Amino acid sequence: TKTTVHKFGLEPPSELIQKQLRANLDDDIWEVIRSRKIDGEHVILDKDYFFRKHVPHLTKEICENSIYEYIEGELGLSISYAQKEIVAEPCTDEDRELLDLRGYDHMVVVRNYVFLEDTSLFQYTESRHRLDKFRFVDFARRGK
Amino acid sequence: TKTTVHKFGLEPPSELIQKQLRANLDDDIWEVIRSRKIDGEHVILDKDYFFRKHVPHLTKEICENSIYEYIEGELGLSISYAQKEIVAEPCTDEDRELLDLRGYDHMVVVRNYVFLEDTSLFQYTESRHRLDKFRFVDFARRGK
Amino acid sequence: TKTTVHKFGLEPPSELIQKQLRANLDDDIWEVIRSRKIDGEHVILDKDYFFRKHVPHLTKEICENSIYEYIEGELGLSISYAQKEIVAEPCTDEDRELLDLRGYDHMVVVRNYVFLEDTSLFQYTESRHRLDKFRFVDFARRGK
Amino acid sequence: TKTTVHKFGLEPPSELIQKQLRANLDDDIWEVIRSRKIDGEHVILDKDYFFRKHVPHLTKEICENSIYEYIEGELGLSISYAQKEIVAEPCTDEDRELLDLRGYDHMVVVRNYVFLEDTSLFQYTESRHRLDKFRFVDFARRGK
Ligand code: NA
Ligand code: NA
Structure with a gap:
């Protein structure tokens, strides 16, 4: 199940990401846009956005793998x-x-x-x- | 936001509810089928199924209100x-x-x-x- | 496993319950204090406090049973x-x-x-x- | 708040860890035993145990930092x-x-x-x- 990185970049936030990520003008934000090919079709589009101030280092190779694992690791x-x-x-x-x-x-x-x-x-x-x-x-766990 | 009870009844389970509810032939199951009208449209269809052995008593009035609250209450x-x-x-x-x-x-x-x-x-x-x-x-709660 | 109701009453909040329940002077608060006897010993002390404005009706018999079920029911x-x-x-x-x-x-x-x-x-x-x-x-559920 | 690694090693499981980790005789298990000094006292004792088959590589330096972050990373x-x-x-x-x-x-x-x-x-x-x-x-999230 292949993963393709379409956009990937470090820039100030667009106005939508200012709202979504509560970021300012002068915050450097990583943007990663990927699609997942669950053979043999591209069916999910994954957009991640997070502050460089907390994750200063990133690569195209980490995005083709797991951003979650990378982030949890750091x-x-x-x-x-x-x-x-x-x-x-x-x-x-x-x-x-x-x-x-x-x-x-x-x-x-x-x-x-x-x-x-x-x-x-x-x-x-x-x-x-x-x-x-x-x-x-998911759960879901009930009772007192 | 009105609630309408379409089906409501106590019978043995159909073959689909046998699978969904892990019920046998000789289990009495309440079935309640409702629609919700979020004015001014009917937009959700709610199907509940649960064993009478655990909830012996039920009414059409409880279904027009909350089955969750009733069940939690009992x-x-x-x-x-x-x-x-x-x-x-x-x-x-x-x-x-x-x-x-x-x-x-x-x-x-x-x-x-x-x-x-x-x-x-x-x-x-x-x-x-x-x-x-x-x-x-939902959450979602992270860390160790 | 018997349940004993020691205090039970409807009064304005003490200063500790004002802080714990974010209640004012002129809020009527139910207080229920119970002990649980897990034979043959009294080993848990359960103190509940909630606003009468949301649960106007209560009895000693409901406290000897389940306050959770009652509250969920209402x-x-x-x-x-x-x-x-x-x-x-x-x-x-x-x-x-x-x-x-x-x-x-x-x-x-x-x-x-x-x-x-x-x-x-x-x-x-x-x-x-x-x-x-x-x-x-508890859980606890992990991953993305 | 300093972290001290007392034991750290890769061996077959003791009989207690066989039960706790559902591991066999011929499973290689990492054991890490640490204490935390929340100045100026040693007050928590942290024992971790996990299979080498899933985490083949580990060091004393990773234990003085975060085993959780490391594991999530891998x-x-x-x-x-x-x-x-x-x-x-x-x-x-x-x-x-x-x-x-x-x-x-x-x-x-x-x-x-x-x-x-x-x-x-x-x-x-x-x-x-x-x-x-x-x-x-924790939560805890309630309702339907
Ligand atoms: Na469609
Ligand atoms: Na003690």
Whole structure:
């Protein structure tokens, strides 16, 4: 199941990432945009954004592997909680260029905001799935 | 936001509920099928199934209110964990009769299996949303 | 495993419960103090405190049974998240009057703050265990 | 807050670790035993045990830093869930040699079992705290 890095770069945030990542003008933000090919189709589009101030070093090779493992490796003990929001959205132009969308009109979009022990929003992920390629499992634990 | 009870009954399980609820032939299962009207449209279809042996008493009035609150009220201390599985599915005939599906072809389907302290699968819920009417939030808590 | 209700009453909050429950002077708060006898010893002291404004009706019989089930029954759908803090504390005078503390000097104290969908702190529980009678299990779920 | 590595080694499992880690005779297990000095006292004793087959490489320097971050870095995407069990135990001889236990007789013991996506128990941690130095926070998330 191959992973392709489409965009990857370190720049100031766009206005959307200023809102999503609570970042300023003068914050250096890593942007990584990838697609996943679950043979033989490109079906998920993964967009990560996180502050360089906390993760100063990154490479194209780390993105073709796991950004999660890399990030946990560098500062997993400072990461406190994440908040997930899963909705469905119309496909966008970016979605149709990069994924094999067949006769699909919508996506399942998982958004995830990762915060540090000190309370700051440090990372933002937007994971866009074709409908047939989305499955989310969890608990859930009940009682007192 | 009105709630309408379409089916409601106490019978032995169909073959699908035998699989979903790990129930036998000679188990009495409550089935409740409801739709939610988030004005002014019917947009969610909620199917609950649970054993009468654990919840012997039920009414149409409890279903028009909250089955969750009722169930927690009777045996919330025995409920241990739930497991959730969220996928997307094509709409079915039952979906089109009961919900206002406009020009919609798919649904977000949340399935939830609730287990007791003694380890048994006791309840099964299948909650079917029109795509624009689905939003799921959670944590997620990270670190050691 | 018998449950004994020692105090139970509806009054304005003490200064400690003002802090613990974020309640004012003119808020009516239910206080329930119970001990659990895990035969044949009294070993846990359970203190619950919650606003009457949200749970207007209560009885001694509900406390000898389950306050959790009762509360979930009345407003479980409005309850959003709880936050738990588990520490160890020296035993207090109240602990020695009401529990069989043998040659025990400390307690395991579980504190739990329950919040509503609207964001307000609605309930506070303080559960004090003798050391040998404390066991807490959980997950914990890992990965992306 | 300094970290001291007392034992560290790669051997077959003792009979206790065979039970705790579900390991055989012919499984190579890393054992790391550390104490934490929260100035100016040694107050926590951390025992980690995990299979070399999954983490082939390790050093004394990684243990003086974070084993969690290291492990997440190597295989965080394969880690599925953990299960935690927190109880209180009498102090042992190992506890009194390595920690400053003053006039303390008991410990808060946090045990944690980490499993992989494939279902196998892969790691076991036993974290022993002096009573005054234990605080555990969590959620807890409620409702349907
Ligand atoms: Na569609
Ligand atoms: Na003691």
